Amino acid sequence: CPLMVKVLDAVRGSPAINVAVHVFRKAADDTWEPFASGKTSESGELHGLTTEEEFVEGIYKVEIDTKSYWKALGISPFHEHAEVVFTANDPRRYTIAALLSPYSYSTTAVVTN
Amino acid sequence: CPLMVKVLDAVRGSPAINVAVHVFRKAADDTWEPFASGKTSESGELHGLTTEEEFVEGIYKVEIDTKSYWKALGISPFHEHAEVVFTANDSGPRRYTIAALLSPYSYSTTAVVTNP
Amino acid sequence: CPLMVKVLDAVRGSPAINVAVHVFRKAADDTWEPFASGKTSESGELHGLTTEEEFVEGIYKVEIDTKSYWKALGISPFHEHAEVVFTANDSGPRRYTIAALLSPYSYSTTAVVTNP
Amino acid sequence: CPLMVKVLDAVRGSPAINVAVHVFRKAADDTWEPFASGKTSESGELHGLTTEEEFVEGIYKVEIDTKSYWKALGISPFHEHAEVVFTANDPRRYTIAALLSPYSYSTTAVVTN
Ligand SMILES: O=c1cc(-c2ccc(O)c(O)c2)oc2cc(O)cc(O)c12
Ligand SMILES: O=c1cc(-c2ccc(O)c(O)c2)oc2cc(O)cc(O)c12
């Protein structure tokens, strides 16, 4: 699991469950092509998005559908989504973590091994 | 002004100065159009991006060039940029302050929305 | 003023108004002494806590009464308060802005330190 | 493991390793008595601080020695430490997470089950 996503809910102090996540890779023509996607689990994690062979150096975007999550809870949100854009470079494992509030979010990368 | 951007450096505990900011607005055909741009001042603030009549309802994107900032300081950061996407003025005009707090492998963004 | 406190509400995307703030200074005998206090204004800011001559070197604690704020809004928050502890003016006088960003089960605090 | 602590480093995008953590419980005389302590592991986690029998309702403080961590890395820090104070109330498990920068930190509680 070279790439993992973890989402937390700052309002309820819990994992953010069933949040849609989309991963894109930047293409030569500079547009974003879909690469992988999923929903966070009960623990607010999304595993299995990709593999070591597949996850080559490049620029990647992770898009988290924050707005649907807040809508689900009946709380007005500010952001359309939360977007994280990064260069992967060459034995690393990437965890993209996000902490969510209706009017704020924080994202962090934990890069290890 | 109805849109202001404020950037802070969590490493040095200072305003993040001379940070490029680009604003886009989603067009009818679903493309992003250039709306405004500028750089943060000595205070880490960017004022004067737009006006009340220009800043109509829509979906707006604020892209903060975090990578260039960190690189200029000798640091190779994780993120390409910090992007904030939002619907504006849906319920009538408001004043928006977009704040970003920057670290090399993390950032937080917050909106303060007030009623003119 | 050399010490200012700014509080924001991450839920409502607004300044956190009428938030009690208490400041203490570590005494010679290692006890915390009352230094100053106040409440955040409509802008979420608290000014006028102290003066340049009063605000000498030392270790300072700023306790923000987050619990009362959330409770007044109907929310039972995780934290009792948000506490910020820091050495001040160790290298000569500085201006300190202590910022807090509040959510019911989370908070962030940041210091902006500038040279008068 | 009713109580767990997780610390991350926002500068290096990594777990915050070997960070000292102290847990206190508020006593009737209103002072803090030491309850438990440890250092974060390689994964930036501290487990085994307490047990279900032991971890009764009360007000607890978790103190993270952020300043020593930054000193270890040669980076000037603002805070003396990061303090998290909370009421535990009654089948919960508590994870206290902290994200560290030299001039800023964020803490979040993930409370589950
Ligand atoms: O100093 C300011 C600091 C912040 C701020 C504080 C914490 C954050 O985690 C964040 O993402 C932004 O937000 C502000 C928002 C303001 O309207 C004015 C300010 O001076 C600040
Ligand atoms: O990677 C983790 C990252 C975070 C986290 C992420 C962002 C924050 O602003 C914060 O304050 C904590 O919280 C976690 C919380 C967990 O329970 C497990 C984890 O692995 C993480």
Coordinates of C-alpha atoms and ligand atoms in Angstrom, one line a residue:
Chain A
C1 CA 0.0 0.0 0.0
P2 CA 2.1 2.8 -1.3
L3 CA -0.8 5.3 -0.9
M4 CA -3.3 5.6 2.0
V5 CA -5.9 8.2 2.8
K6 CA -7.2 8.9 6.3
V7 CA -10.0 11.3 7.1
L8 CA -11.1 12.7 10.5
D9 CA -14.1 14.6 11.7
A10 CA -13.3 17.5 14.1
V11 CA -16.9 18.2 14.9
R12 CA -17.8 14.7 16.1
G13 CA -14.3 13.6 17.1
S14 CA -14.4 10.5 15.0
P15 CA -13.3 8.9 11.8
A16 CA -14.9 10.4 8.7
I17 CA -16.8 7.5 7.3
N18 CA -18.0 6.9 3.8
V19 CA -16.2 9.9 2.4
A20 CA -15.6 9.7 -1.3
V21 CA -12.1 10.1 -2.5
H22 CA -10.7 10.4 -6.0
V23 CA -7.1 10.2 -7.1
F24 CA -5.8 11.7 -10.3
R25 CA -2.5 11.6 -12.1
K26 CA -1.3 14.5 -14.1
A27 CA -1.1 13.8 -17.8
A28 CA 1.3 15.0 -20.4
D29 CA -1.4 17.3 -21.8
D30 CA -1.5 18.7 -18.3
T31 CA -5.0 17.5 -17.5
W32 CA -6.0 15.2 -14.7
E33 CA -6.8 11.6 -15.4
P34 CA -8.6 9.4 -13.0
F35 CA -6.3 6.9 -11.4
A36 CA -8.2 5.5 -8.4
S37 CA -11.1 6.1 -6.0
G38 CA -12.9 4.8 -3.0
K39 CA -14.8 5.6 0.2
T40 CA -13.3 5.8 3.6
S41 CA -14.0 2.9 5.9
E42 CA -15.4 2.8 9.4
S43 CA -12.0 3.7 10.7
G44 CA -11.9 6.6 8.2
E45 CA -9.2 5.0 6.1
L46 CA -9.0 4.2 2.4
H47 CA -6.5 1.5 1.5
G48 CA -5.7 -0.4 -1.6
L49 CA -5.9 2.5 -3.9
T50 CA -2.9 1.5 -5.9
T51 CA 0.2 -0.7 -6.1
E52 CA 4.0 -0.2 -6.1
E53 CA 4.2 -1.0 -9.8
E54 CA 1.5 1.4 -10.7
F55 CA 2.4 4.2 -8.4
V56 CA 5.2 5.8 -10.4
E57 CA 6.8 9.2 -10.0
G58 CA 4.5 12.0 -11.1
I59 CA 2.2 14.6 -9.8
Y60 CA -0.9 13.3 -8.2
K61 CA -4.1 14.9 -6.9
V62 CA -6.3 13.5 -4.2
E63 CA -9.7 14.9 -4.0
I64 CA -11.9 14.4 -0.9
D65 CA -15.6 15.1 -1.2
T66 CA -16.0 17.0 2.0
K67 CA -19.2 18.8 0.9
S68 CA -21.2 15.6 0.6
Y69 CA -20.0 14.5 4.0
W70 CA -21.1 17.7 5.7
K71 CA -24.4 17.6 3.8
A72 CA -24.9 14.1 5.0
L73 CA -24.7 15.4 8.6
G74 CA -26.9 18.4 8.0
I75 CA -24.1 21.0 8.5
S76 CA -23.4 23.8 6.0
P77 CA -19.9 23.5 4.6
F78 CA -17.7 26.1 3.0
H79 CA -15.5 24.1 0.7
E80 CA -16.6 22.3 -2.4
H81 CA -14.0 19.6 -1.6
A82 CA -10.5 19.3 -0.3
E83 CA -7.8 18.8 -2.8
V84 CA -4.2 17.7 -2.2
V85 CA -1.7 17.9 -4.9
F86 CA 1.8 16.5 -4.7
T87 CA 4.8 15.1 -6.5
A88 CA 5.6 11.5 -5.7
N89 CA 9.3 10.8 -6.0
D90 CA 11.6 8.0 -5.8
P91 CA 10.9 2.9 -1.0
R92 CA 8.2 5.3 0.3
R93 CA 4.7 4.9 1.6
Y94 CA 2.4 7.9 1.6
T95 CA -0.4 8.6 4.0
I96 CA -2.5 11.6 3.2
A97 CA -4.4 12.7 6.3
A98 CA -7.2 15.2 6.5
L99 CA -8.9 16.8 9.4
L100 CA -12.3 18.2 8.6
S101 CA -14.4 21.0 9.9
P102 CA -17.3 22.7 8.2
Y103 CA -15.3 25.9 7.5
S104 CA -11.8 24.6 7.8
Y105 CA -9.6 21.7 7.0
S106 CA -6.0 20.6 7.5
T107 CA -4.0 18.1 5.5
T108 CA -0.8 16.5 6.3
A109 CA 1.5 14.0 4.6
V110 CA 3.2 11.2 6.5
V111 CA 5.9 9.8 4.3
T112 CA 7.8 6.8 5.6
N113 CA 10.3 4.0 4.8
Chain B
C1 CA -12.8 44.3 -0.3
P2 CA -14.9 41.2 -0.3
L3 CA -12.1 38.7 -0.8
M4 CA -8.9 38.7 1.2
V5 CA -6.2 36.1 1.6
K6 CA -4.0 35.7 4.6
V7 CA -1.0 33.3 4.8
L8 CA 1.1 32.3 7.8
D9 CA 4.3 30.4 8.2
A10 CA 4.1 27.8 10.9
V11 CA 7.8 27.2 11.0
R12 CA 9.0 30.7 11.5
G13 CA 5.9 32.0 13.3
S14 CA 5.5 34.8 10.8
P15 CA 3.4 36.0 8.0
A16 CA 4.3 34.3 4.8
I17 CA 5.4 37.1 2.6
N18 CA 5.6 37.4 -1.2
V19 CA 3.4 34.3 -1.7
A20 CA 1.7 34.2 -5.1
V21 CA -2.0 33.7 -5.1
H22 CA -4.2 33.0 -8.2
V23 CA -8.0 33.2 -8.2
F24 CA -10.2 31.5 -10.8
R25 CA -14.0 31.4 -11.3
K26 CA -15.9 28.5 -12.9
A27 CA -17.3 29.6 -16.2
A28 CA -20.6 28.6 -17.8
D29 CA -18.9 25.8 -19.8
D30 CA -17.4 24.4 -16.6
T31 CA -14.0 25.7 -17.3
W32 CA -11.9 27.7 -14.8
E33 CA -11.4 31.2 -15.8
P34 CA -8.8 33.6 -14.5
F35 CA -10.3 36.0 -12.0
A36 CA -7.5 37.8 -10.2
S37 CA -4.1 37.4 -8.8
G38 CA -1.5 38.9 -6.5
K39 CA 1.2 38.4 -3.8
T40 CA 1.0 38.5 -0.1
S41 CA 2.5 41.6 1.6
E42 CA 4.8 42.0 4.5
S43 CA 1.9 41.2 6.7
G44 CA 1.0 38.0 4.9
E45 CA -2.2 39.6 3.5
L46 CA -3.5 40.1 0.0
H47 CA -6.0 42.8 -0.4
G48 CA -7.6 44.3 -3.4
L49 CA -8.2 41.2 -5.4
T50 CA -11.7 42.2 -6.4
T51 CA -14.7 44.4 -5.9
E52 CA -18.3 44.0 -4.7
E53 CA -19.7 44.3 -8.2
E54 CA -17.2 42.0 -9.9
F55 CA -17.4 39.3 -7.3
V56 CA -20.7 37.8 -8.3
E57 CA -22.1 34.4 -7.3
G58 CA -20.2 31.5 -8.4
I59 CA -17.6 28.8 -7.7
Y60 CA -14.2 30.2 -7.0
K61 CA -10.8 28.7 -6.7
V62 CA -7.9 30.2 -4.8
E63 CA -4.6 28.6 -5.5
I64 CA -1.7 29.5 -3.2
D65 CA 1.8 28.9 -4.5
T66 CA 3.2 27.2 -1.4
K67 CA 5.8 25.3 -3.2
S68 CA 7.7 28.4 -4.4
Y69 CA 7.6 29.8 -0.9
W70 CA 9.2 26.8 0.7
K71 CA 11.7 26.4 -2.0
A72 CA 12.8 30.0 -1.7
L73 CA 13.5 29.2 1.9
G74 CA 15.6 26.1 1.0
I75 CA 12.9 23.6 1.8
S76 CA 11.4 21.0 -0.5
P77 CA 7.8 20.8 0.5
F78 CA 5.2 18.1 0.0
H79 CA 2.4 20.0 -1.7
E80 CA 2.5 21.6 -5.1
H81 CA 0.2 24.3 -3.8
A82 CA -2.7 24.9 -1.5
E83 CA -6.1 25.1 -3.3
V84 CA -9.3 26.4 -1.8
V85 CA -12.6 25.8 -3.7
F86 CA -15.8 27.4 -2.7
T87 CA -19.2 28.7 -3.7
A88 CA -19.5 32.4 -3.0
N89 CA -22.3 34.8 -2.5
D90 CA -24.9 32.1 -2.8
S91 CA -27.0 33.8 -0.2
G92 CA -26.2 37.3 -1.1
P93 CA -22.9 39.2 -0.9
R94 CA -20.5 38.3 1.9
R95 CA -16.9 39.2 2.9
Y96 CA -14.5 36.3 2.7
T97 CA -11.2 35.9 4.3
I98 CA -9.3 32.8 3.2
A99 CA -6.6 32.0 5.7
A100 CA -3.8 29.5 5.2
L101 CA -1.3 28.2 7.7
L102 CA 1.7 26.6 6.2
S103 CA 4.2 23.9 7.1
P104 CA 6.4 22.0 4.7
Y105 CA 4.4 18.7 4.9
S106 CA 1.1 20.2 6.0
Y107 CA -1.3 23.0 5.7
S108 CA -4.6 24.2 7.1
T109 CA -7.1 26.6 5.5
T110 CA -10.0 28.3 7.1
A111 CA -12.7 30.7 5.9
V112 CA -14.0 33.6 7.8
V113 CA -17.3 34.8 6.3
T114 CA -18.9 37.9 7.5
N115 CA -21.9 39.8 6.4
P116 CA -21.1 43.2 5.0
Chain C
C1 CA 0.1 46.1 22.4
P2 CA 2.7 43.3 22.6
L3 CA 0.2 40.5 23.3
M4 CA -2.9 39.9 21.3
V5 CA -5.2 36.8 21.1
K6 CA -7.3 35.9 18.2
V7 CA -9.9 33.2 18.2
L8 CA -11.8 31.6 15.3
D9 CA -14.8 29.2 15.0
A10 CA -14.1 26.5 12.4
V11 CA -17.8 25.4 12.5
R12 CA -19.5 28.6 11.7
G13 CA -16.5 30.2 9.9
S14 CA -16.6 33.2 12.1
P15 CA -14.7 35.0 14.8
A16 CA -15.3 33.4 18.2
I17 CA -16.9 36.1 20.1
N18 CA -17.1 36.6 23.9
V19 CA -14.5 33.9 24.6
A20 CA -12.8 34.3 28.0
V21 CA -9.0 34.4 28.0
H22 CA -6.8 34.3 31.1
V23 CA -3.1 34.9 31.1
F24 CA -0.6 33.8 33.8
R25 CA 3.1 34.3 34.3
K26 CA 5.4 31.8 36.0
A27 CA 6.7 33.3 39.3
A28 CA 10.0 32.9 41.0
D29 CA 8.7 30.0 43.1
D30 CA 7.5 28.2 40.1
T31 CA 3.9 29.0 40.7
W32 CA 1.6 30.6 38.0
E33 CA 0.5 34.1 38.8
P34 CA -2.4 35.9 37.3
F35 CA -1.2 38.3 34.7
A36 CA -4.2 39.6 32.7
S37 CA -7.5 38.6 31.4
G38 CA -10.3 39.6 29.0
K39 CA -12.8 38.4 26.4
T40 CA -12.7 38.3 22.6
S41 CA -14.6 41.1 20.8
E42 CA -16.9 40.9 17.8
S43 CA -13.9 40.4 15.7
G44 CA -12.6 37.5 17.8
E45 CA -9.7 39.6 19.0
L46 CA -8.5 40.5 22.4
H47 CA -6.3 43.6 22.7
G48 CA -5.0 45.6 25.5
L49 CA -4.0 42.7 27.7
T50 CA -0.7 44.2 28.7
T51 CA 2.0 46.8 28.0
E52 CA 5.6 46.8 26.8
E53 CA 6.9 47.6 30.3
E54 CA 4.7 45.1 32.1
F55 CA 5.3 42.3 29.7
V56 CA 8.8 41.3 30.8
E57 CA 10.7 38.2 30.0
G58 CA 9.2 35.1 31.4
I59 CA 7.1 32.0 30.8
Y60 CA 3.5 32.8 30.1
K61 CA 0.4 30.8 29.9
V62 CA -2.7 31.8 27.9
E63 CA -5.8 29.7 28.7
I64 CA -8.7 30.1 26.4
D65 CA -12.1 29.0 27.7
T66 CA -13.2 27.0 24.8
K67 CA -15.6 24.8 26.7
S68 CA -17.9 27.7 27.8
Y69 CA -17.9 28.9 24.2
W70 CA -19.1 25.6 22.7
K71 CA -21.5 25.0 25.5
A72 CA -23.2 28.3 24.9
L73 CA -23.7 27.2 21.4
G74 CA -25.3 23.9 22.5
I75 CA -22.3 21.8 21.9
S76 CA -20.5 19.6 24.4
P77 CA -16.9 19.9 23.4
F78 CA -13.9 17.5 24.1
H79 CA -11.4 19.9 25.7
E80 CA -11.7 21.8 28.9
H81 CA -9.8 24.7 27.4
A82 CA -7.0 25.5 25.0
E83 CA -3.8 26.4 26.8
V84 CA -0.8 27.9 25.2
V85 CA 2.5 28.0 27.1
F86 CA 5.5 30.0 26.0
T87 CA 8.7 31.8 26.8
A88 CA 8.5 35.5 25.9
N89 CA 10.9 38.2 25.2
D90 CA 13.9 35.9 25.7
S91 CA 15.7 37.7 23.0
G92 CA 14.4 41.2 23.6
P93 CA 10.9 42.5 23.3
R94 CA 8.6 41.1 20.6
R95 CA 5.0 41.4 19.6
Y96 CA 3.0 38.2 20.0
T97 CA -0.2 37.2 18.4
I98 CA -1.7 34.0 19.7
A99 CA -4.2 32.6 17.3
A100 CA -6.6 29.7 18.1
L101 CA -8.8 27.9 15.6
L102 CA -11.7 26.1 17.3
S103 CA -13.7 22.9 16.6
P104 CA -15.7 20.9 19.1
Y105 CA -13.1 18.0 19.1
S106 CA -10.1 19.8 17.9
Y107 CA -8.1 23.0 18.0
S108 CA -5.0 24.5 16.5
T109 CA -2.9 27.3 17.9
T110 CA -0.3 29.4 16.2
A111 CA 2.0 32.1 17.2
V112 CA 2.9 35.0 15.1
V113 CA 6.0 36.8 16.5
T114 CA 7.1 40.1 15.1
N115 CA 9.8 42.5 16.0
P116 CA 8.5 45.8 17.1
Chain D
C1 CA -6.2 0.5 25.3
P2 CA -8.6 3.0 26.4
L3 CA -6.1 5.9 25.8
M4 CA -3.7 6.3 22.9
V5 CA -1.5 9.2 21.9
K6 CA -0.3 9.9 18.3
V7 CA 2.1 12.6 17.3
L8 CA 3.1 13.8 13.9
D9 CA 5.8 16.1 12.5
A10 CA 4.5 18.6 10.0
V11 CA 8.0 19.8 9.0
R12 CA 9.4 16.4 8.1
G13 CA 6.1 14.7 7.2
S14 CA 6.7 11.9 9.6
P15 CA 5.8 10.4 12.8
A16 CA 7.2 12.3 15.8
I17 CA 9.4 9.7 17.4
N18 CA 10.7 9.6 20.9
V19 CA 8.5 12.4 22.1
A20 CA 7.9 12.4 25.9
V21 CA 4.3 12.3 27.0
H22 CA 2.9 12.7 30.5
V23 CA -0.6 12.0 31.6
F24 CA -2.1 13.5 34.8
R25 CA -5.4 13.2 36.5
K26 CA -7.0 16.0 38.4
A27 CA -7.1 15.5 42.1
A28 CA -9.7 16.5 44.6
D29 CA -7.4 19.3 45.8
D30 CA -7.4 20.4 42.2
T31 CA -3.8 19.6 41.5
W32 CA -2.5 17.3 38.9
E33 CA -1.2 14.0 39.8
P34 CA 0.9 11.9 37.5
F35 CA -1.0 9.0 36.2
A36 CA 1.1 7.7 33.3
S37 CA 3.9 8.5 30.8
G38 CA 5.9 7.3 27.9
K39 CA 7.7 8.1 24.7
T40 CA 6.2 7.8 21.2
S41 CA 7.4 4.9 19.2
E42 CA 8.7 4.8 15.7
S43 CA 5.2 5.1 14.4
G44 CA 4.7 8.1 16.6
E45 CA 2.3 6.3 18.8
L46 CA 2.1 5.7 22.5
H47 CA 0.1 2.7 23.6
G48 CA -0.4 1.0 26.9
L49 CA -0.7 4.1 29.0
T50 CA -3.6 2.8 31.0
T51 CA -6.3 0.2 31.5
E52 CA -10.1 0.1 31.5
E53 CA -10.3 -0.5 35.2
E54 CA -7.9 2.4 35.9
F55 CA -9.2 4.9 33.4
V56 CA -12.2 6.1 35.3
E57 CA -14.2 9.3 34.7
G58 CA -12.4 12.4 35.5
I59 CA -10.4 15.3 34.1
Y60 CA -7.2 14.3 32.5
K61 CA -4.3 16.3 31.1
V62 CA -1.9 15.0 28.5
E63 CA 1.3 16.9 28.2
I64 CA 3.5 16.5 25.2
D65 CA 7.1 17.6 25.4
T66 CA 7.2 19.4 22.0
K67 CA 10.1 21.7 22.9
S68 CA 12.6 18.9 23.5
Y69 CA 11.6 17.4 20.2
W70 CA 12.3 20.5 18.3
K71 CA 15.5 21.1 20.2
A72 CA 16.5 17.6 19.2
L73 CA 16.1 18.6 15.5
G74 CA 17.8 22.0 15.9
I75 CA 14.7 24.0 15.2
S76 CA 13.6 26.9 17.5
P77 CA 10.2 26.2 18.9
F78 CA 7.6 28.6 20.3
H79 CA 5.7 26.4 22.8
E80 CA 7.0 25.0 26.1
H81 CA 4.9 22.0 25.5
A82 CA 1.5 21.0 24.1
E83 CA -1.2 20.4 26.8
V84 CA -4.5 18.7 26.2
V85 CA -7.1 18.8 28.9
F86 CA -10.3 16.8 28.8
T87 CA -13.1 15.1 30.7
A88 CA -13.4 11.4 30.3
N89 CA -17.0 10.2 30.5
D90 CA -18.8 7.1 30.6
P91 CA -17.4 1.8 26.2
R92 CA -15.1 4.5 24.7
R93 CA -11.5 4.5 23.4
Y94 CA -9.7 7.8 23.1
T95 CA -7.0 8.7 20.7
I96 CA -5.3 12.0 21.3
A97 CA -3.6 13.1 18.1
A98 CA -1.2 16.0 17.7
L99 CA 0.3 17.6 14.7
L100 CA 3.4 19.5 15.4
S101 CA 5.1 22.6 13.9
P102 CA 7.7 24.8 15.5
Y103 CA 5.3 27.7 15.9
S104 CA 2.0 25.9 15.7
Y105 CA 0.2 22.7 16.8
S106 CA -3.2 21.1 16.3
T107 CA -4.7 18.5 18.5
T108 CA -7.7 16.4 17.9
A109 CA -9.6 13.7 19.8
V110 CA -10.9 10.6 18.1
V111 CA -13.4 9.0 20.4
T112 CA -14.8 5.6 19.3
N113 CA -16.9 2.6 20.3
Ligands
LIG1 O1 -3.7 35.6 12.4 C1 -4.6 34.9 11.9 C2 -4.4 33.5 11.9 C3 -5.4 32.8 11.3 C4 -5.4 31.4 11.3 C5 -5.1 30.8 12.6 C6 -5.1 29.5 12.6 C7 -5.2 28.8 11.5 O2 -5.2 27.4 11.6 C8 -5.5 29.3 10.2 O3 -5.7 28.4 9.1 C9 -5.5 30.6 10.2 O4 -6.5 33.3 10.8 C10 -6.7 34.6 10.9 C11 -7.9 35.1 10.4 C12 -8.1 36.5 10.4 O5 -9.3 36.9 9.9 C13 -7.1 37.3 10.9 C14 -5.9 36.8 11.4 O6 -5.0 37.7 11.8 C15 -5.7 35.5 11.4
LIG2 O1 -2.2 9.9 10.7 C1 -3.0 10.4 11.5 C2 -3.1 11.8 11.4 C3 -3.9 12.5 12.3 C4 -4.1 13.8 12.2 C5 -4.1 14.5 11.0 C6 -4.2 15.8 11.0 C7 -4.3 16.5 12.2 O2 -4.4 17.8 12.1 C8 -4.3 15.9 13.4 O3 -4.4 16.7 14.6 C9 -4.2 14.6 13.4 O4 -4.7 11.8 13.1 C10 -4.6 10.5 13.2 C11 -5.5 9.9 14.1 C12 -5.6 8.5 14.2 O5 -6.4 7.9 15.0 C13 -4.7 7.8 13.4 C14 -3.8 8.3 12.5 O6 -3.1 7.5 11.8 C15 -3.8 9.7 12.4

